[PDB]
Amino acid sequence: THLSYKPGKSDDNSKAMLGQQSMPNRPNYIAFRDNFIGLMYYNSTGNMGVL
Amino acid sequence: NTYDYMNKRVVAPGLVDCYINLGARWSLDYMDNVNPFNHHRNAGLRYRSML
Amino acid sequence: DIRGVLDRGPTFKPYSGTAYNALAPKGAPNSCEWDEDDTRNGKKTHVYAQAPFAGEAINKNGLQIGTNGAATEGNKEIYADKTYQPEPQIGESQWNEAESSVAGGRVLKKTTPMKPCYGSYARPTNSNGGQGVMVEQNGKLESQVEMQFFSTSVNAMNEANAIQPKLLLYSEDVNMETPDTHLSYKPGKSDDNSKAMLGQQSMPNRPNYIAFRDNFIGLMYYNSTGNMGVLAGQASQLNAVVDLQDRNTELSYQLLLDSIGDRTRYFSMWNQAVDSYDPDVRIIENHGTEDELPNYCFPLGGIGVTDTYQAIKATNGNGGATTWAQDNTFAERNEIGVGNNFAMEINLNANLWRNFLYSNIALYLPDKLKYNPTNVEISDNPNTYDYMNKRVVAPGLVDCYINLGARWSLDYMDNVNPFNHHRNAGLRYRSMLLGNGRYVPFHIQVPQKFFAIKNLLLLPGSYTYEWNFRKDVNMVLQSSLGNDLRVDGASIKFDSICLYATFFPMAHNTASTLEAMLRNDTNDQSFNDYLSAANMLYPIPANATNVPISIPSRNWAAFRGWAFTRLKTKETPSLGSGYDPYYTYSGSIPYLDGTFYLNHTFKKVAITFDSSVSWPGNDRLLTPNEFEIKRSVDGEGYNVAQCNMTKDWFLVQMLANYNIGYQGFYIPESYKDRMYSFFRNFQPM
């Protein structure tokens, strides 16, 4: 979470700070692409494969 | 580009609410040019990332 | 190809629920003030409101909110503008936010009516959102908002001019409208703003879509001897299209389009979207809800009550008995609770199920189970929109307990035409195609549906091609509820109509060869309509269970068979005639797009040639001389398929549809069994 409303500036404990609140961070997944696209070079004169 | 900038820029709820373009099956003009696949609802990306 | 302008009238609401302040409670009124008899007699005025905004100080100018530090008069003050300040919605920040000194707010005037916050609108009147009405003085528009200072009531106890101010309310005037909601509990007949009127409630009006029918049915005159079309050779001065009042074209095109393709997908060009209905609205799979856990709200700040307390450091005893004392390290007055924090409570799921079960079934019950309202004027015309909007239907009829745990449909709801609804997905799609407003300029393409020239390959020449179109407003359109449309005044005007056609860039000589080859006598064109049936309609007076029909002597060469069904007279225009004035229903004709529901309302049928020789012939059927469709419970040995029907009628239907039945039944293949079939649309309960 990250504080979605911070009334004060200094983080010191104070009477007002009993009013701060929160909000969950947005989700983002991360994985391997479809069909591993890009995992294998192609189409580039630099690193041509060999059979 | 990093995460926190995308996580802490806040946007007013009022821009979209249950009184938007009522009755009309329709897409928001700001959203006809934003890649609709970099979007967390995506089933394939979700499945791959869980796997 | 047609271009025109459509107006859908005043009675078109395309959404369930309302739009304005929908979160506010359905009995909460806005800030206002009304008049009470003095207690001549100087009638007094009472105020119900609150002041959310917090400011600095109050003087005879108003409430000060700014401080221009570099002002010419030192630190001159900045008072809120009376036209839009203070904003209605600006409030506090934190859940505690201890009270300020002064405060301000907005409040209506006694002149305008009072309506609950749920469903309240008033158009703005300045660039910054002001709602105060304007008045022309000296030829220029000016405002009328006027302060209303206020102050403690403790006034009532000691002290004097020490009376200082402590809450300025700004007060004005609006042009309040309630476009899509109506009153559901009005306590008094009179309208003068009482004390009790602060508790009136409002609810929204049933959604009601209006759009073009499927495949643009009704837009072109077919089967009308008065206004038959024409496609003929120009010089011929002789016709080439003939028609009778029985060739029922539109249903035939419906069925043909069913046969050679799928239907559960939509094509925008011809409005191809058949009208479904949710399988759970018609038939209820009610088995309660999952609520083993209780739900519970909580105090915005977590703990609700409290109880000051005092630190007591343990200045322990001396020798024996343990004494105590006080400490000065801590504070002196502390907030502390005891026990479980105060909490409210709600059952979640059952509320959602109950809301849905009321809203999607109960409002459509047959009219004879509803009761007029109190203290609201309701139209005396039992077809218009208002009547259907304002009757009251007891929620106790349908709720969580009805037919619990059983799969069933209510006997009241069997004969209600279930394609007139608002979850009929095809209707929603079509109504959204045009747009959600009420003034619509449109641009459409209509097919040609008469079979005898539907596919004919024309050959070179000059032809006269001409046709007629309807201007009626309940034929070419269709509602969602079934209300008339001439009453409510929705109009439609055709401006330009142009004709398009496509060719093939065939090679010259090849086309010449084909033309010469096809002009010969012996290779002409043959065409056959899909339905290939007659049409007979016979009246059925109310509360009768017997219909005889006789056909006089005639020959029957090359017959095929009988099809039949039943229809409601209120939902069927007269044939042939170009305009049926006695027609006052704009729902969905079954006779013109194939939507039948009365099929279960039959008992049996019997046939005879020359009044003495029955025709199942020769004792084939289990009953002697009659097709026993359905038996009542007395049929101790012939009910089949765990339901009402008899075996033999089941056998006859299964044969005639799928050629199954002489070797044990089973589920016929997919592609052999289409949407309008038998087995796709069979439900025992």
Partner: protein, 95 residues
């Protein structure tokens, strides 16, 4: 444990169809022009038809929708340039 005594009801729904009875002698469909349609009995003589219906009562006026099934065919001929002629046949219930 305390269930009251009860009786049982049953009924079916047949939304969105037609009821069919074809003119075979075995209730099958073995080709469009059915066998009984050309038998000598029903093609070279006259006959009179009587149908009797028993239904379930209602409250508003209604219509019985009967569909006799026959053939409807059209032959279209066009000898010269820009002249088209046709002929129709609708067997019994003819024009």
């Amino acid at each position: 444990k305390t269930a009251v005594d009860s009786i049982t009801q049953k009924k079916f729904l047949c939304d969105r169809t037609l009821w069919r009875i074809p003119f075979s002698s075995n209730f099958m469909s073995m080709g469009a022009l059915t066998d009984l349609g050309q038998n000598l009995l029903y093609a070279n003589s006259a006959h009179a038809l009587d149908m009797t219906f028993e239904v379930d009562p209602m409250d508003e006026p209604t219509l019985l929708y009967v569909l006799f099934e026959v053939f409807d065919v059209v032959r279209v001929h066009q000898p010269h340039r820009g002249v088209i002629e046709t002929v129709y046949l609708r067997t019994p219930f003819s024009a």
